[PDB]
Paper text:
The spike (S) protein of HKU1 plays a crucial role in cell invasion by binding to host receptors, with the transmembrane serine protease TMPRSS2 recently identified as its protein receptor. The S protein of HKU1-B forms a trimeric structure, with each protomer featuring a furin cleavage site “RRKRR”, akin to SARS-CoV-2. S1 comprises four domains: N-terminal lectin-like domain (NTD), RBD, subdomain 1 (SD1), and subdomain 2 (SD2). S2 includes the fusion peptide (FP), the heptad repeat regions 1 (HR1), the central helix (CH), the connector domain (CD), the heptad repeat regions 2 (HR2), the transmembrane domain (TM), and the C-tail domain (CT).
To unravel the mechanism underlying the interaction between the S protein of HKU1-B and the host cell receptor TMPRSS2, we elucidated the cryo-EM structures of the HKU1-B S protein incubated with TMPRSS2 in various conformations, including a closed conformation, two 1up conformations (designated as 1up-1 and 1up-2), two 2up conformations (with or without TMPRSS2 bound, referred to as 2up-TMR and 2up-1), and a 3up conformation with TMPRSS2 bound (referred to as 3up-TMR). In the 3up-TMR conformation, all three RBDs are fully in “up” position, each bound with a TMPRSS2 molecule. Compared to the 2up-TMR conformation, the 3up-TMR rotates clockwise by 8°, with its RBDs leaning more towards the central axis. In a counterclockwise sequence (protomer 1-2-3), the magnitude of conformational changes of RBDs and NTDs gradually decreases, with minimal change observed in the NTD of protomer 3. The three TMPRSS2 molecules form interfaces maintained by cation–π and π–π interactions. Additionally, in the 3up-TMR conformation, the CH bundle shifts outward by 2 Å compared to the 2up-TMR conformation, indicating the efficacy of the receptor binding on the modulation of the S protein conformation and subsequent membrane fusion. To improve the local resolution of the interface region, we employed local refinement for the 3up-TMR conformation, achieving a local resolution of 3.6 Å, allowing reliable interface modeling and analysis. The RBD primarily binds to the TMPRSS2 molecule through polar interactions. The RL2 loop of the RBD firmly clasps the SP domain of TMPRSS2 like a clamp, near the active pocket of SP domain, creating an interface of 850 Å2. The Lys487 and Asp507 of the RL2 loop form salt bridges with Asp417 and Arg470 of TMPRSS2, respectively.
Residue numbers in the entry:
A (entry chain A): 349 to 596
B (entry chain D): 148 to 492
Write the structure that this text describes.
Amino acid sequence: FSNCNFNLSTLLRLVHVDSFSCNNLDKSKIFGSCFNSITVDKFAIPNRRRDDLQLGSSGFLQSSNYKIDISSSSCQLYYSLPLVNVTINNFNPSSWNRRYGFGSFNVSSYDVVYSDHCFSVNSDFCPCADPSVVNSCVKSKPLSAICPAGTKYRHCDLDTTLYVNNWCRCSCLPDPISTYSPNTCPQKKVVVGIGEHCPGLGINEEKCGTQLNHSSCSCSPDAFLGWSFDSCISNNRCNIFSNFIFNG
Amino acid sequence: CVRLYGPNFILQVYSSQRKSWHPVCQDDWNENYGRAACRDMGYKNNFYSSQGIVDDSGSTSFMKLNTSAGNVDIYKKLYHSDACSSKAVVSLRCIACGVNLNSSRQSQIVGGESALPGAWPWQVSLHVQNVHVCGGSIITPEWIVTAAHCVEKPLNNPWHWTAFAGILRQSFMFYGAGYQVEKVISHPNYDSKTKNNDIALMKLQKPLTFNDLVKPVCLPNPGMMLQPEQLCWISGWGATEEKGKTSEVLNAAKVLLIETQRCNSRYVYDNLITPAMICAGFLQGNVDSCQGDSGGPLVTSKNNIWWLIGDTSWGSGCAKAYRPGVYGNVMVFTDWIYRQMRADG
Ligand SMILES: *[C@@H]1O[C@H](CO)[C@@H](O)[C@H](O)[C@H]1NC(C)=O
Ligand SMILES: *[C@@H]1O[C@H](CO)[C@@H](O)[C@H](O)[C@H]1NC(C)=O
């Protein structure tokens, strides 16, 4: 919201406020001054993780969903909304999960899908194994398909046991949440920054593929892991967080 | 039936009625019982020390002396008692094993500084036809441990097994510069499929010296209570990357202990690791330290004193992803050696 006029009293009585703190500011210094823009960022709140949002904290929501910056002259609002007509949009913001077949979540009508870990990959990522290598494997042989163009394959070895010679061993085991060798799986775990989205849910690397028709490399809906939810509805009213940033 | 135990070396004593090992109180013990007690567990002409110590072992059926009777054996004069009459128990050292010069920066498995001489004073090198092949660790001047799959067929006769100690470099062990062969015992259950019992003792005829570069490593005790993520210090001249030959100098950096349930799970090693096989390394990427020596030992430092826990064995590709090293388990059979060291004299 830039280049316009506003106040506060019609605002905070026209939306059902439950709190309005501030930080780096005094609550009456809004009423006089003339800023340069305002940047309101809103989202709903999952109920049992509401205490993630303390100003300058650890947790899930401030670390892998939306990091509340503790430097500018922000002012945080916690309001409510009647649940007559409320349709929570639940869409995934990452490119490389919808590229590998992320359709949707199954949650209820009023459940908000937050995040736990947020893993980042490169541009040439391909979570399927190499099918022209994998046929001579016998032990631990994974599913595979053909990657799209330029996406380099997953690194899979047929290294040698004490007796068996072609037994499969790839990277990213068992799941990249709890991998044994973190310095080798391409899905690197990163913490989200100020004003960024969670760059992708983690893919379990061993549910992405089939055996016979090695098509373009897709995945399967059980394999995206690292998200949970809860219901926003408390006191018959879906609570909502919303930030403000009073820059300039 | 007599054995050492734990950190403070209490003699445990087995009785057929109590079916159990039991400690001896220090009520009128003597070196004529004590210095003649190291030949019971395979130490003929050596002894170090004996003192009184406080009881903390955990048995409530002690062993006492039948000094009221006349001249009988040690092994007849041992009845039970509920209390130690002076509250001192067996403390023992059968040999001058243990200490080194506590030095600082010996780290020459890849990316470090060389093993300082005298700070790993048990490190040997074994040779056939003067090429460096396998290592080991000394526990007596006459006995020497190594991995059994060096002494496998068709090289299973002792007269071609030349030990060569002392010098960090690949050169200075010359003919005469290192004592030589005798008896090759083996744990006689090595296999091709498992490599279960990949530990074979060796013997020498000529007793060497505890001078500077040579000192016997401490063999562990029955039930000495390691820690499940303990630090471990290996040594050896092994090739730091595979399809090599041998490193030039002595390399003695550090590794860690992986437990069973990580190695023996489904992804590392699919249910292979026996009770007589110990895993070691770090279950990680290319952070591991290879230095392949097949006997280049695993030395830990519990009770501020170096102890031997594992001698090396087979592995996978040199120090890479998911694939640790798997070590022979030399607290399992520290008494089998002590019934194969009893009757060489
Ligand atoms: C909900 O939607 C209906 C029709 O879409 C609308 O008439 C009604 O006013 C809405 N509810 C509220 C509280 O405004
Ligand atoms: C979520 O949706 C999928 C497909 O619609 C269905 O298989 C699953 O049973 C649903 N979850 C629950 C808890 O019913």
